[PDB]
Amino acid sequence: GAMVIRDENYFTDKYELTRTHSEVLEAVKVVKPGKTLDLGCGNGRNSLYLAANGYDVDAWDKNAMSIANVERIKSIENLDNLHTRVVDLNNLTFDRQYDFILSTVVLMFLEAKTIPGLIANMQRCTKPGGYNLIVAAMDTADYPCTVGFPFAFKEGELRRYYEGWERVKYNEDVGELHRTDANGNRIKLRFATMLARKK
């Protein structure tokens, strides 16, 4: 009989994908299966894990090839509850209500002028009791952006956006990019990480 567990190794070991994001794995201990939106899904590590575990996933990205790859894997695995779209997040408005919206390591790639409108759109489209998970690069006095991302959160800025939500988790811890500097050392930067629940 076919083994039903779909853990953080499943898509990782079968389709050469990076392991499911640590914050997605944590989030699901708290966030129950529901209508989900993965904004900038890439090659789908997070959308695929979610859909395989009962979440109804809208998985969106600008990269047509990345979307094709998600669709390829979706077809192989019969993930009926995973739906894809090639979208430009800089030029996008949406209107469906969701239990869970996540954007993991995507927002720093967007135009700075997109962010206020997108975050407001995210909050608008979360159900009361629903959750938003965001992880994104920052640019701070102690950890300046050395990559030149077109956007990065300032210290305290993500928290300010989500005033009035319950911040189940919020930190601006120093992390590392995978890309390296002139001496081959991983680039150190703070990331804003938040799991927040709407009242």
Ligand X SMILES: Nc1ncnc2c1ncn2[C@@H]1O[C@H](C[C@@H](N)CC[C@H](N)C(=O)O)[C@@H](O)[C@H]1O
Binding site for ligand X (CB under 6 A): 21, 40-42, 45-46, 61-63, 66, 87-90, 104-106, 109-110
We find the least distance from the C-beta atom of residue 96 to ligand X, in angstroms, to be 17
Compare residues 61 and 99 and give the one whose CB is closer to ligand X: 61
We find the least distance from the C-beta atom of residue 190 to ligand X, in angstroms, to be 17
**Closest residue to bound ligand X by CB:** 42
The answer to whether the annotation marks 159 as part of a ligand binding site is no
The answer to whether the annotation marks 148 as part of a ligand binding site is no
We find the least distance from the C-beta atom of residue 91 to ligand X, in angstroms, to be 8
Contact criterion met (CB below 8 Å) for 145 and 180: no
We find the least distance from the C-beta atom of residue 105 to ligand X, in angstroms, to be 5
Task: List all residues 6 or more positions away from 187 whose beta carbon is below 8 Å from its beta carbon.
Answer: 146, 147, 176, 177, 179, 180, 181
- For residue 139, give both structure tokens: 């640019």
Strands 186-197, 126-137: parallel, antiparallel or unpaired by DSSP?
antiparallel
**CA-to-CA distance for 175 and 156, rounded, in angstroms?**
16
Compare residues 63 and 140 and give the one whose CB is closer to ligand X: 63
We find the least distance from the C-beta atom of residue 21 to ligand X, in angstroms, to be 5
Q: Count the alpha carbons within 13 Å of 170 in the hemisphere toward its beta carbon.
A: 17
The answer to whether the annotation marks 42 as part of a ligand binding site is no
Question: What would the 3-class secondary structure string for 138-185 be?
Answer: ECCCCCCCCCCCCCCECCCHHHHHCCCCEEEEEECCEEEEEEECCCCC
Compare residues 118 and 196 and give the one whose CB is closer to ligand X: 118
What are the residues facing 23 on neighbouring strands? Answer: none
Compare residues 113 and 156 and give the one whose CB is closer to ligand X: 113
Binding residues: 40, 45, 61, 104, 179
Binding residues for S-adenosyl-L-methionine: 40, 45, 61, 104
